Symmetry: C3
Subunit: 316 residues, 3 copies
Amino acid sequence: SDEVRKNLMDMFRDRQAFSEHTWKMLLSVCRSWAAWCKLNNRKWFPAEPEDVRDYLLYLQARGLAVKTIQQHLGQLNMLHRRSGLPRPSDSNAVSLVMRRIRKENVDAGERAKQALAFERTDFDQVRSLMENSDRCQDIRNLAFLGIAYNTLLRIAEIARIRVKDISRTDGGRMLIHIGRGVEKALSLGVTKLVERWISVSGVADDPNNYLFCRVRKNGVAAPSATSQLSTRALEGIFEATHRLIYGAKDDSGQRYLAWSGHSARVGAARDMARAGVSIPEIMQAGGWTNVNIVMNFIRNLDSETGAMVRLLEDGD
Amino acid sequence: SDEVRKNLMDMFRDRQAFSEHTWKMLLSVCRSWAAWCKLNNRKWFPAEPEDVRDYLLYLQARGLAVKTIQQHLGQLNMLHRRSGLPRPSDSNAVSLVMRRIRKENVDAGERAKQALAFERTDFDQVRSLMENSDRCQDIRNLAFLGIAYNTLLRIAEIARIRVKDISRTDGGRMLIHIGRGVEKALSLGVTKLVERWISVSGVADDPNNYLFCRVRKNGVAAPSATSQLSTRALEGIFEATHRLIYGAKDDSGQRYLAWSGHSARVGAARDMARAGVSIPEIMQAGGWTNVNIVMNFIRNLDSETGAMVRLLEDGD
Amino acid sequence: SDEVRKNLMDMFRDRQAFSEHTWKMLLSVCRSWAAWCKLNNRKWFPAEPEDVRDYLLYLQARGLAVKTIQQHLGQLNMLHRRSGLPRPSDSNAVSLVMRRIRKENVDAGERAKQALAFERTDFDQVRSLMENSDRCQDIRNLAFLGIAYNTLLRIAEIARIRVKDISRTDGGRMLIHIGRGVEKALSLGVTKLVERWISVSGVADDPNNYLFCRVRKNGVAAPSATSQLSTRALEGIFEATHRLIYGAKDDSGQRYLAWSGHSARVGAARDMARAGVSIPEIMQAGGWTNVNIVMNFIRNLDSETGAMVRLLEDGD
DNA sequence: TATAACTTCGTATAGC
DNA sequence: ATATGCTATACGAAGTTAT
DNA sequence: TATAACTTCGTATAGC
DNA sequence: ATATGCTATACGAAGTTAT
DNA sequence: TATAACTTCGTATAGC
DNA sequence: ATATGCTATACGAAGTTAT
């Protein structure tokens, strides 16, 4: 909606105050809230608590996730916080509602989902199928999956690696520099996969080139120092790779039926936990600084570690 | 008190809103609060802050633990929260009090107790005395202690295991399914102890039978699919076993003089921590999802792990 | 300022209510706040929110750290909390300010500093230079550094160890008792360094003597059971030792250019994390009970542990 | 051209 | 067991190019 | 019957 | 270092059965 | 005496 | 990702002793 858009074209005096992704959500939420206000004849701004309360129930009644509802409330609070007005959340009507909503949804067995894990068994299998391939796409995709699994980097970080970010370390292994500002080390095998992609694509012809680039139907790579592969394409590589082994996905429309952008990070974190790796080393592997946050991420450890069986059988 | 009882027979429109144990405490607290109100001539409901404040001080002045006092305040807040009335806790008189109370009690050196640990040395010792026994009670009790230590399950969970929950895994070891929904793996030795109990008691004659059942003075087991051993009896097994090795307990009336229902969970958690097991694997062993919660549980690690001595002596 | 001093000579009915260090800070803050109030003509007590707000901005505008600003606000809240007056912090003007202040400072890239690490490589190097020394000062200093690194004890705890606190454990290693109430174990090598210091200084002539004592320019030790080395002298040993290997420090006036009192605790914690030691064992090594607190301490792990490279190369 | 292989986009929701 | 704030990924679909 | 071996119960308090 | 909400275990004692 | 080697002190800031 | 409360260390400098 322009009234919201045309206007949201206008305001918030200092752009760099919020992330672009953040601005996008504020706008989507504002469109939603505005449309609901229009249909139900309520005042859009400043919002009235009883109205916000009813709007949140409306989201819940349409099947939205608690995190989604928290998001809409979040933006509303923002919009408002910026023009110095009591945030909808500080109205006790909105507070009781978010509480009720959380409780029901939970008692409804609802819980935050998580990407389908791409683990070491998955990596070895894909490597089995793909390693001998002479297809440019396969060479690129396999290097991408190796990095994703080895480094646990998010797709947006991987899309932004430039050739100059790569250096060598112990044994010839590659080291990838990630700016705000760490260095990610690759194994000999993954370094080898990346070296192949680099050699075939010619990305190293200009050190400012992004490590990964498009590969057209012709099989011709298009190195570039100004254009990154979208995070959407990187998610597509995970999806394609899944299709390759398992065929097309069930038409349920449910999320996570195939690997996605977060799959290798989810998978590698579970593998480290399953292997008895300590928390600090797991934290370093994925760049976490909060233990609570890392443990929530690995809440779906998916194999039995049998620490008590091992102790009782004394190792064995 | 019936006024509280006879009435607490009446209300709270949807039972399944609170756990039965929860209802029990609400009632005990209500009886306490009502009696105090009666003796001191105060209004029981709705409660007045200054009165709640004085009632909490009364609990403290009678030697109750902070967790106990928090409990009584907790129920009072509830009773009240349900009929939409400011919770006693939101009165600043009650807030300052709980704060003062916590500080003094603490400065008084008071700290949350913990069950006497039943550890691997304890398990091996009991196994030494009991393993050759031909007494039905000993066969049952030793299997119970093996499961408790190996699985870290709470007594209420152990009381509810049915024979059909048991399956086999790698090596013939048993796997015990625990519904809301995990699988607990037993060592070869504990599986063997459980197999013996199963074989002698005949519980496996009906898969719906609870794994553990009563054993009368005659030595005749009474398998059942409708009646569980009480958690009280399971605590009694820990107590009896302690008496067996250490004689009767000192008459101080202090808690935790003998092993209790939580002993093997406390003990096994300390053993895993002492053996250098990682946190995620310790969490999986006992079913924890919050790191803070697992670490508070293992706050009494009771042997020196000497990580710095090992590093300095380089392992050794 | 006496008005603040001469008066802060007077009040707070029960000294042992706050730590002496705490009283010192309250006084320094009160002097600061009073001087600012004087210069700017504002009322010192009870403080007005708008005034506190401006005073905090004044601290920020003079380049102070967020933790420093929180400190001044902290004492102000105290002074006030004690005479039952709304704490400056409960004024929304002070709340918004602390929030704004935290955000800017952060966005300014400001982050809590940490002592320069004294790690195992540092300990081995210093031991290389110093171990053959016949200088009383070197013998004492090397034992001090060994204890600091091995035990992770704070300088105030080390200053207070008395000879009677020392006992022997497995292998002749020393055990040091630390009262509120743990036992710190020393390696064979560090025990040996401590034994030498003990033998040369004669501190063991009276078991009540503090383990570490002054060593005058003459090289004559002064054992004592009533006087401890100051924590300032212990920090000086770290500084001197750093100078010994690296020369004098850059005149930038920046903190942490040389080792300080917390260096060996920072260093040993990083070494344990880097060696794959589990969190509970790291917690026991340094006396931590909160996982969050231990992880924040080790937020600067300074070598690559390569958990994913190891897994991929399968250990190797 | 058809099309592979992307890119952009908006709502939904996980993770730091 | 836990609440809120900001920024990321998820993914169907519609738009874009160089075949 | 006496009694072992439970079960139920209420207040107290640990743990998720 | 930390507060509150809900549900568990702790345990003496009194009630129950099948000896 | 000069001085090493401390101690005390006040403001600044990390860590429990 | 996070706020507040209390107690520690950081360190330049000025004061103290026994050389």
